[PDB]
């Protein structure tokens, strides 16, 4: 494509009215208040590496009769912030991972009393070999996963 | 230190 696969755009609903574009070439894409993060969002509540998105090769266990994803790539949203982010309706605690479907609205920080409302809209513009792009569908209906040493290592270099 | 949290 042009260089971007996913677009995270801090929508007007959030105190930030900007648009972020995750270059399919960059994996994983880091977001936070630190310029070091591929994504730049200055939020007093946010952390240097509040959260980062990581793309992985999607592959089911088996393909009997029906032809599943086969073996393409998907984008996972990783959260490393202590303020925990919110993905649509699923909780994102420090060290969690979640599937990012085309049009994924992720809340980086939300304060009921502070009125601090944040949220980015994920928009897959380019599909760099995506089984679909981002429909997030499986036995589990939108579930939050945990992070491991592999993920922690990605941010370690950050 | 940096202590973040949201209730």
Curated annotation (Swiss-Prot), chain A:
Post-translational modification, as annotated: Autophosphorylated. Phosphorylated in response to DNA double-strand breaks; dephosphorylation is mediated by PTC2 and PTC3.
Location of the protein in the cell: Nucleus
Parts of the chain that traverse the membrane: none
Record domain FHA: where: 29-92
Superkingdom: Eukaryota
Subunit structure: Interacts (via domain FHA 1) with PTC2 (when phosphorylated); the interaction is direct and serves to regulate DNA damage checkpoint signaling. Interacts with PIN4.
Domain-related comment: FHA domains are phosphothreonine recognition modules, FHA 1 strongly selects for Asp at position +3 relative to phosphothreonine, whereas FHA 2 selects for Ile in this position.
Note in the entry: Present with 6900 molecules/cell in log phase SD medium.
Family from the record: Belongs to the protein kinase superfamily. CAMK Ser/Thr protein kinase family. CHEK2 subfamily.
Role according to the record: Controls S-phase checkpoint as well as G1 and G2 DNA damage checkpoints. Phosphorylates proteins on serine, threonine, and tyrosine. Prevents entry into anaphase and mitotic exit after DNA damage via regulation of the Polo kinase CDC5. Seems to be involved in the phosphorylation of RPH1.
Record-given protein name: Serine/threonine-protein kinase RAD53
Taxonomic placement: Eukaryota, Fungi, Dikarya, Ascomycota, Saccharomycotina
Residues shown, of full length: 573 to 730 of 821
Curated annotation (Swiss-Prot), chain B:
Protein name per UniProt: DNA repair protein RAD9
Subunit composition and interactions: Physically associates with RAD53.
Biological role: Essential for cell cycle arrest at the G2 stage following DNA damage by X-irradiation or inactivation of DNA ligase.
Gene assigned in the entry: RAD9
Subcellular location as annotated: Nucleus
Note: Present with 400 molecules/cell in log phase SD medium.
Full-protein interval shown: 826 to 832 of 1309
Coiled coil: none
């Amino acid at each position: 494509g042009n260089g971007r696969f996913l677009t995270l755009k801090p929508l007007p609903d959030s105190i930030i009215q900007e648009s972020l574009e995750i270059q399919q070439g960059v994996n994983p894409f880091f977001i936070g208040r630190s310029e070091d993060c591929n994504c730049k969002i200055e939020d007093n509540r946010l952390s240097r590496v509040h959260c980062f998105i990581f793309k992985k090769r999607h592959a089911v266990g088996k393909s009997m009769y029906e032809s599943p994803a086969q073996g393409l790539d998907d984008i996972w949203y990783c959260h490393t912030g202590t303020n925990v982010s919110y993905l649509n309706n699923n909780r994102m605690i420090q060290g969690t991972k979640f599937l990012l479907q085309d049009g994924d609205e992720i809340k980086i920080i939300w304060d009921k009393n502070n009125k601090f409302v944040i949220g980015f809209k994920v928009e897959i513009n380019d599909t760099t070999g995506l089984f679909n792009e981002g429909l997030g569908m499986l036995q589990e209906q939108r579930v939050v996963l945990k992070q491991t040493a592999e993920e922690k290592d990605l941010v370690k270099k950050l | 230190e940096d202590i973040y949290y949201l209730d």
